[PDB]
Amino acid sequence: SEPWFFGCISRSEAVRRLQAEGNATGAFLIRVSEKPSADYVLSVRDTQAVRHYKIWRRAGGRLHLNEAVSFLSLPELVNYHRAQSLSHGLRLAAPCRKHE
């Protein structure tokens, strides 16, 4: 259990990160919303390609990638993502590995 918060990785680094051979499906990372505003985006290799998601906060202390997945905080929000694959093509697992 570890997403690896990285708010300094473009949609390119993440795409090549999750897809990389450092994750056997399930990898997930929490970066910053390069497109959105004051939020965080998560990317998971799922089971092959790279899937991203926008994490909208409840302005106060609660992140939710959807209207059916909200959590006081990020670390907690993920915990549920791992167990429930609802808003996720593949229940999270380990942190997105890279090459360095």
PDB file of C-alpha atoms in Angstrom:
ATOM      1  CA  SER A   1       0.000   0.000   0.000  1.00  0.00           C
ATOM      2  CA  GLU A   2       1.723   3.139  -1.282  1.00  0.00           C
ATOM      3  CA  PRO A   3       0.679   5.491  -4.126  1.00  0.00           C
ATOM      4  CA  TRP A   4       3.643   7.863  -3.897  1.00  0.00           C
ATOM      5  CA  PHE A   5       2.536  11.502  -3.926  1.00  0.00           C
ATOM      6  CA  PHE A   6       4.269  13.254  -6.822  1.00  0.00           C
ATOM      7  CA  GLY A   7       2.930  16.692  -7.689  1.00  0.00           C
ATOM      8  CA  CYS A   8       5.826  17.297 -10.063  1.00  0.00           C
ATOM      9  CA  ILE A   9       5.198  14.688 -12.757  1.00  0.00           C
ATOM     10  CA  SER A  10       3.625  15.551 -16.111  1.00  0.00           C
ATOM     11  CA  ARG A  11       1.086  13.318 -17.852  1.00  0.00           C
ATOM     12  CA  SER A  12       4.077  11.991 -19.790  1.00  0.00           C
ATOM     13  CA  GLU A  13       6.223  10.865 -16.857  1.00  0.00           C
ATOM     14  CA  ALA A  14       3.256   9.162 -15.194  1.00  0.00           C
ATOM     15  CA  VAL A  15       2.145   7.431 -18.391  1.00  0.00           C
ATOM     16  CA  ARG A  16       5.646   6.007 -18.808  1.00  0.00           C
ATOM     17  CA  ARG A  17       5.841   5.313 -15.074  1.00  0.00           C
ATOM     18  CA  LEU A  18       2.687   3.254 -14.554  1.00  0.00           C
ATOM     19  CA  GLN A  19       3.239   1.430 -17.845  1.00  0.00           C
ATOM     20  CA  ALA A  20       6.904   0.908 -16.973  1.00  0.00           C
ATOM     21  CA  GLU A  21       8.051  -2.578 -15.972  1.00  0.00           C
ATOM     22  CA  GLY A  22       8.253  -1.450 -12.361  1.00  0.00           C
ATOM     23  CA  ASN A  23       4.617  -2.263 -11.635  1.00  0.00           C
ATOM     24  CA  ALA A  24       2.828  -5.572 -12.185  1.00  0.00           C
ATOM     25  CA  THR A  25      -0.569  -3.896 -12.497  1.00  0.00           C
ATOM     26  CA  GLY A  26      -2.147  -1.941  -9.661  1.00  0.00           C
ATOM     27  CA  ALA A  27       0.465   0.804  -9.434  1.00  0.00           C
ATOM     28  CA  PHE A  28      -0.878   4.258  -8.569  1.00  0.00           C
ATOM     29  CA  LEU A  29       0.586   7.719  -7.967  1.00  0.00           C
ATOM     30  CA  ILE A  30      -0.848  10.980  -6.633  1.00  0.00           C
ATOM     31  CA  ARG A  31       0.317  14.049  -8.552  1.00  0.00           C
ATOM     32  CA  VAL A  32      -0.958  17.587  -9.123  1.00  0.00           C
ATOM     33  CA  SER A  33      -3.771  18.568 -11.486  1.00  0.00           C
ATOM     34  CA  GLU A  34      -1.894  19.974 -14.478  1.00  0.00           C
ATOM     35  CA  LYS A  35      -5.238  20.707 -16.131  1.00  0.00           C
ATOM     36  CA  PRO A  36      -7.736  21.029 -13.228  1.00  0.00           C
ATOM     37  CA  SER A  37      -7.405  23.542 -10.393  1.00  0.00           C
ATOM     38  CA  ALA A  38      -6.267  23.190  -6.782  1.00  0.00           C
ATOM     39  CA  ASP A  39      -6.595  19.402  -6.901  1.00  0.00           C
ATOM     40  CA  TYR A  40      -4.727  16.130  -7.419  1.00  0.00           C
ATOM     41  CA  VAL A  41      -4.728  13.493 -10.160  1.00  0.00           C
ATOM     42  CA  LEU A  42      -4.004   9.778  -9.794  1.00  0.00           C
ATOM     43  CA  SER A  43      -2.700   7.409 -12.469  1.00  0.00           C
ATOM     44  CA  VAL A  44      -2.833   3.610 -12.399  1.00  0.00           C
ATOM     45  CA  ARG A  45      -1.395   1.114 -14.877  1.00  0.00           C
ATOM     46  CA  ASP A  46      -4.539  -0.924 -14.205  1.00  0.00           C
ATOM     47  CA  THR A  47      -3.460  -4.044 -16.094  1.00  0.00           C
ATOM     48  CA  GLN A  48      -1.545  -2.635 -19.062  1.00  0.00           C
ATOM     49  CA  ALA A  49      -2.048   0.909 -20.343  1.00  0.00           C
ATOM     50  CA  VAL A  50      -2.088   3.987 -18.111  1.00  0.00           C
ATOM     51  CA  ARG A  51      -5.285   5.309 -16.530  1.00  0.00           C
ATOM     52  CA  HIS A  52      -5.537   8.689 -14.804  1.00  0.00           C
ATOM     53  CA  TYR A  53      -8.187  10.266 -12.578  1.00  0.00           C
ATOM     54  CA  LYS A  54      -9.016  13.713 -11.199  1.00  0.00           C
ATOM     55  CA  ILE A  55      -9.213  14.082  -7.417  1.00  0.00           C
ATOM     56  CA  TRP A  56     -11.613  16.858  -6.419  1.00  0.00           C
ATOM     57  CA  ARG A  57     -11.328  18.153  -2.854  1.00  0.00           C
ATOM     58  CA  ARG A  58     -14.259  19.260  -0.696  1.00  0.00           C
ATOM     59  CA  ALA A  59     -12.498  22.539   0.084  1.00  0.00           C
ATOM     60  CA  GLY A  60     -11.589  21.803   3.689  1.00  0.00           C
ATOM     61  CA  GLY A  61     -10.197  18.292   3.911  1.00  0.00           C
ATOM     62  CA  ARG A  62     -11.728  15.613   1.698  1.00  0.00           C
ATOM     63  CA  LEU A  63     -10.598  14.250  -1.669  1.00  0.00           C
ATOM     64  CA  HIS A  64     -12.859  12.386  -4.093  1.00  0.00           C
ATOM     65  CA  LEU A  65     -12.075  11.188  -7.617  1.00  0.00           C
ATOM     66  CA  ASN A  66     -15.828  10.904  -8.167  1.00  0.00           C
ATOM     67  CA  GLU A  67     -19.243  11.630  -6.659  1.00  0.00           C
ATOM     68  CA  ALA A  68     -19.168   8.146  -5.129  1.00  0.00           C
ATOM     69  CA  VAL A  69     -15.620   8.062  -3.762  1.00  0.00           C
ATOM     70  CA  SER A  70     -14.823  10.724  -1.164  1.00  0.00           C
ATOM     71  CA  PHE A  71     -12.337  10.552   1.709  1.00  0.00           C
ATOM     72  CA  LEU A  72     -11.351  13.075   4.378  1.00  0.00           C
ATOM     73  CA  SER A  73      -7.812  12.833   2.997  1.00  0.00           C
ATOM     74  CA  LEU A  74      -5.856  11.335   0.099  1.00  0.00           C
ATOM     75  CA  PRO A  75      -4.076   8.476   1.942  1.00  0.00           C
ATOM     76  CA  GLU A  76      -7.496   7.388   3.196  1.00  0.00           C
ATOM     77  CA  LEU A  77      -9.220   7.902  -0.154  1.00  0.00           C
ATOM     78  CA  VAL A  78      -6.827   5.402  -1.725  1.00  0.00           C
ATOM     79  CA  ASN A  79      -7.273   2.789   1.002  1.00  0.00           C
ATOM     80  CA  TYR A  80     -10.831   2.396  -0.280  1.00  0.00           C
ATOM     81  CA  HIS A  81      -9.676   2.409  -3.906  1.00  0.00           C
ATOM     82  CA  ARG A  82      -7.533  -0.655  -3.210  1.00  0.00           C
ATOM     83  CA  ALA A  83     -10.391  -2.612  -1.646  1.00  0.00           C
ATOM     84  CA  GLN A  84     -13.166  -1.371  -3.930  1.00  0.00           C
ATOM     85  CA  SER A  85     -12.495  -1.239  -7.672  1.00  0.00           C
ATOM     86  CA  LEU A  86     -15.583   0.917  -8.219  1.00  0.00           C
ATOM     87  CA  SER A  87     -14.071   4.103  -9.643  1.00  0.00           C
ATOM     88  CA  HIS A  88     -10.996   2.186 -10.799  1.00  0.00           C
ATOM     89  CA  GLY A  89     -10.335  -0.231 -13.644  1.00  0.00           C
ATOM     90  CA  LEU A  90      -8.021  -2.066 -11.259  1.00  0.00           C
ATOM     91  CA  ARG A  91      -7.849  -2.017  -7.460  1.00  0.00           C
ATOM     92  CA  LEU A  92      -4.637  -0.228  -6.482  1.00  0.00           C
ATOM     93  CA  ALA A  93      -1.755  -2.249  -5.038  1.00  0.00           C
ATOM     94  CA  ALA A  94       1.804  -0.927  -4.802  1.00  0.00           C
ATOM     95  CA  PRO A  95       3.561   2.376  -5.656  1.00  0.00           C
ATOM     96  CA  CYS A  96       4.410   3.256  -9.257  1.00  0.00           C
ATOM     97  CA  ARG A  97       8.038   2.247  -9.792  1.00  0.00           C
ATOM     98  CA  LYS A  98      10.365   4.026 -12.221  1.00  0.00           C
ATOM     99  CA  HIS A  99      13.922   3.817 -13.552  1.00  0.00           C
ATOM    100  CA  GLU A 100      16.516   5.793 -11.592  1.00  0.00           C
TER     101      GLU A 100
END
